[PDB]
Write a protein that binds this ligand. Structure first.
Ligand code: HEM
Ligand code: HEM
Ligand code: HEM
Ligand code: HEM
Lengths: 146, 141, 141, 146
């Protein structure tokens, strides 16, 4: 993904303020609530039969943390997303059969959660740069389908 | 398809938006044009200058249209038939763009109403916008 | 959202499709499992050998459900809520898979009834299957 | 795309029977009727305000032939679809801004038209090999986004 220095500074500055424990859990939790077919992939986490069960579930928070840590890694490797995410794409595509459209939904939910957390600071301009980033990450996760 | 619970979440959350609909409208549209540049192709006569009176006037009309829908949840195709003629017959908007605007509206509501935008209300609003989007991309008269 | 003309196209086409409903069902499913092998993960207990009793029995049921739907175009959420319970609440089928079965059904109807499968009937049937899909993937009770 | 030698013979055998004059216009024509937003890309072709006008429009038939000639080329070049379709990916993605969902819709409509034309001969097995081919083509046309 190709960001101008202006875009990259903006993404990086905001990203340094992110609480990864908190944000990843809220993003993964909202994914499972808003798009309820996604709960099928996480059946082993226990009961996900309600918003309140999903958002209090410790495996969901711990997993959200792992997802966001992987996103952070993608952020300092933007010009090599494909190589960085190769094994991760293999796992999601070959072993888990996750349709690529679900990678886009999780990226957009993370953008919602950033807006929710940061308020005014998440300007339209900062948003626009993050959209480039989440699309880059979604693409990298899907490349093993190509 | 909306549940009885979804209908309540929508009506309740829309109450809290109060008189700022128009302003959220305009901001969601601006976030759309900036984050997804291919959408401007549908508005070749717009001035895209930040805070333009045109974008302001447009955001107003979108939020009026959503307020009207919230009032007619049991008959969206009924309430929105004129807007469907516009988007589906006349403009021929690719349904992909509706998902982008819907996303920008959610981003904007979460930005101004963090405490009302709980995971359950987010779920019901997403479904609301998807339902509205189907109607405006369908030719049914 | 189906137009009045779509409703007439669907009803009148489904009359022709008639007594062979069950056979088209079985063939559309088999085409889905072969064409899109990932869909088989929802059916771990099925025998997938081509003659399969299980596949033929399942094909027939999917056909009965569609026949029922055609009788209830004005109230799909109402007619189809038990199937929504199953698909949306219990099985949690990813909506992508509905676009795959819907495509296989059309492939199968165009195969056996090319005279009825005009461009205008193809259009109405696609929207029929999209509407059915939206009901079966939505939690509304 | 990787096809077994049995899949490749089934694909090429059937393709040899295709009326390159007519199938293209039938597939493009149906795309425009069934997915009416696609009409917006082809407004220079004249009135597409009904099924009859679409299917009888000569520019639609002439264009459909060009699309199919491209699918043919791809068939001779399955192990390098990306470089075969590079010019076409740039045209559709960078100049025309066709959302990639639309390539997938055209691919499937072409499989509908093949089934319509060939009947019993277009078996579930032949269809399955064709689904691998249209997916390869869609993905190659979408390469400039990724
Ligand atoms: C788009 C960004 C995504 C990222 C960065 C991501 C990241 C990750 C990571 C880092 C792991 C752990 C891998 C390991 O054990 O080394 C994982 C596992 C997993 N992911 Fe994702 N994921 C994404 C999207 C999705 C989506 C959308 C789904 C489902 C719809 C999903 C389903 C799963 C499942 C089921 C696991 C296995 C969890 C377990 O170990 O039980 N992922 N993912
Ligand atoms: C939540 C979905 C949407 C709603 C409720 C909505 C509502 C409206 C309204 C109220 C109008 C004004 C009607 C009038 O001219 O009197 C309008 C016009 C218009 N809409 Fe939308 N719209 C939606 C989505 C979209 C999308 C996704 C696009 C394309 C990106 C779009 C493109 C346009 C255009 C180009 C106009 C005419 C602009 C002008 O001439 O000033 N709409 N819409
Ligand atoms: C038009 C779309 C569909 C219709 C009308 C439909 C209809 C049906 C019907 C009538 C049944 C039997 C219900 C019963 O007797 O209790 C059923 C079961 C089932 N459906 Fe569907 N279905 C559709 C799409 C799908 C898709 C896309 C999938 C996943 C690829 C799927 C997965 C299943 C499964 C796993 C069962 C249970 C099978 C068994 O245990 O015997 N369905 N469906
Ligand atoms: C299998 C997928 C497709 C293939 C193989 C294909 C192939 C082609 C070819 C060969 C051309 C002519 C370029 C030249 O002058 O050499 C073309 C042009 C064009 N394509 Fe496609 N296309 C595909 C999908 C689509 C879709 C889905 C759309 C829009 C919905 C689209 C819209 C257009 C338009 C508007 C032109 C320019 C037509 C003109 O100015 O005459 N294409 N495409």
């Amino acid at each position: 993904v190709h960001l101008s220095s202006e875009e990259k500074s903006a993404v990086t500055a905001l990203w340094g303020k992110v609480n990864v424990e908190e944000v990843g859990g809220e993003a993964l939790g909202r994914l499972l609530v808003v798009y309820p077919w996604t709960q099928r992939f996480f059946e082993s986490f226990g009961d996900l039969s309600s918003a309140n069960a999903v958002m209090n579930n410790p495996k969901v928070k711990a997993h959200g943390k792992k997802v966001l840590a992987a996103f952070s890694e993608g952020l300092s490797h933007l010009d090599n997303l494909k190589g960085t995410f190769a094994k991760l794409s293999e796992l999601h595509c070959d072993k888990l059969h996750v349709d690529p459209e679900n990678f886009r939904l999780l990226g957009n939910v993370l953008v919602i959660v950033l807006s929710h957390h940061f308020g005014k600071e998440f300007t339209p301009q900062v948003q626009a740069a993050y959209q480039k980033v989440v699309a880059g990450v979604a693409n990298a996760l899907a490349h093993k389908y190509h | 398809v909306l549940s009885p619970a979804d209908k309540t979440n929508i009506k309740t959350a829309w109450e809290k938006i109060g008189s700022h609909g128009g302003e959220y409208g305009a901001e969601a549209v601006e976030r759309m044009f900036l984050g997804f540049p291919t959408t401007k192709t549908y508005f070749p006569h717009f001035d895209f200058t930040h805070g333009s009176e045109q974008i302001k006037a447009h955001g107003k009309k979108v939020s009026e249209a959503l307020t009207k829908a919230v009032g007619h949840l049991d008959d969206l195709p009924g309430a929105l038939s004129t807007l469907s003629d516009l988007h589906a017959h006349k403009l021929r908007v690719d349904p992909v763009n509706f998902k982008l605007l819907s996303h920008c509206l959610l981003v904007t509501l979460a930005n101004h109403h963090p405490s009302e935008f709980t995971p359950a209300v987010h779920a019901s609003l997403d479904k609301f916008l998807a339902n509205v989007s189907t109607v405006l991309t369908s030719k049914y008269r």
